[PDB]
Scaffold this active site. Structure first.
Site, PDB file in Angstrom:
ATOM      1  N   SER A  43      53.494   3.916  99.933  1.00 47.59           N
ATOM      2  CA  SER A  43      54.205   2.994  98.825  1.00 47.59           C
ATOM      3  C   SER A  43      53.234   3.103  97.285  1.00 47.59           C
ATOM      4  CB  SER A  43      54.712   1.640  99.684  1.00 47.59           C
ATOM      5  OG  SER A  43      55.780   2.201 100.003  1.00 47.59           O
ATOM      6  N   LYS A  46      54.367   4.671  94.602  1.00 45.85           N
ATOM      7  CA  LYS A  46      55.519   4.097  93.627  1.00 45.85           C
ATOM      8  C   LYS A  46      55.098   3.766  92.217  1.00 45.85           C
ATOM      9  CE  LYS A  46      58.113   2.429  96.997  1.00 45.85           C
ATOM     10  NZ  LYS A  46      57.995   1.479  98.254  1.00 45.85           N
TER      11      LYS A  46
HETATM   12  B1  LIG Z   1      56.195   1.202 101.235  1.00 51.15           B
HETATM   13  O1  LIG Z   1      55.269   1.882 101.956  1.00 51.15           O
HETATM   14  O2  LIG Z   1      55.932   0.113 101.302  1.00 51.15           O
HETATM   15  C1  LIG Z   1      56.514  -0.893 101.963  1.00 51.15           C
HETATM   16  C2  LIG Z   1      57.730   0.351 102.081  1.00 51.15           C
HETATM   17  C3  LIG Z   1      58.942  -0.373 103.749  1.00 51.15           C
HETATM   18  O3  LIG Z   1      59.192   1.419 104.230  1.00 51.15           O
HETATM   19  O4  LIG Z   1      57.114   1.077 101.532  1.00 51.15           O
END
Ligand SMILES: *[B@@]1([O])O[C][C]([C][O])O1
Length: 261
Positions: A43, A46
């Protein structure tokens, strides 16, 4: 240095593979540990998707207020915020905040769609000079974190430089940069990771990541009280597919870095 010896010892004690990159913006000095090895981003990717949408909003001034419908088919494995708006809409700003501050996976997939697919996120990285970042998949499969698989990876050095450019540099417009910083500072998932190894007086903006193979990541901008900011990336992954998360390793690596300043 002492710090690289201590990070190596921390890694040895943990049983996994640790990657660290620190940029001290005071003198542009860098501390790297496995700085040019690839790690699964999970994540932490993101941040790049949100920043790419922010960059689009420099020309499409109203883009962040654009409503996006959340349908049941959109929901994936972890959607703490999107779940609250199923059969309703969220703006691109709300989706960016959700992706960053709650690590919402549905929000990330909507950001990727807005950018025309994973290749649109990667393109943004290239556009700001990051030749290492690659996003190949959507949520949740980008978290498989398979050893040796180059998909959805970057290196600590590359991510630290890119995070510096996005938050402290001028890869984004002034209003967009400030928005990104505000979002990172309001992260809710980071209390046990880098933040836990740092003095409580320091201001931290971060994005965590977690995935298979016990992958446990955090990338942070750090504003020490009365001192130039720091950028710190800590990536950690383990040899067992079902390994447990090790946020304590990230806290410990931050503490070791903070000691050396
Ligand atoms: B990212 O890695 O952070 C939380 C989510 C759970 O799949 O993805």
């Amino acid at each position: 240095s002492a710090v690289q010896q201590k990070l190596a010892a921390l890694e040895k004690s943990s049983g996994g593979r640790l990657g660290v990159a620190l940029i001290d913006t005071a003198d542009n000095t860098q501390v790297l540990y496995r700085g040019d090895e690839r790690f699964p981003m999970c994540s932490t990717s993101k941040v790049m998707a949100a920043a790419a949408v922010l960059k689009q909003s420099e020309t499409q001034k109203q883009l962040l207020n654009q409503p996006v419908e959340i349908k049941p088919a959109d929901l994936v494995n972890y959607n703490p915020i999107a779940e609250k708006h199923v059969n309703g809409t969220m703006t691109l700003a709300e989706l960016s905040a959700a992706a960053l501050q709650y690590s919402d996976n549905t929000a990330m997939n909507k950001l990727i769609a807005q950018l025309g697919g994973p290749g649109g996120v990667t393109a943004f990285a290239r556009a700001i000079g990051d030749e290492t970042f690659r996003l190949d998949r959507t949520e949740p499969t980008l978290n498989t974190a398979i050893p040796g698989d180059p998909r959805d990876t970057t290196t600590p050095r590359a991510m630290a430089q890119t995070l510096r450019q996005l938050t402290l540099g001028h890869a984004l417009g002034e209003t967009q940069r400030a928005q990104l910083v505000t979002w990172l500072k309001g992260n809710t998932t980071g209390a046990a990771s880098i933040r836990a190894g740092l003095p409580t007086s320091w201001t931290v903006g971060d994005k965590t990541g977690s995935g298979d193979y016990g992958t446990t990541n955090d990338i942070a901008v750090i504003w020490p009280q009365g001192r130039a900011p720091l950028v710190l990336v800590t990536y950690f992954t383990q040899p067992q597919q079902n390994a447990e998360s090790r946020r304590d390793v990230l806290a410990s690596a931050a503490r070791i870095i903070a000691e050396g300043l």
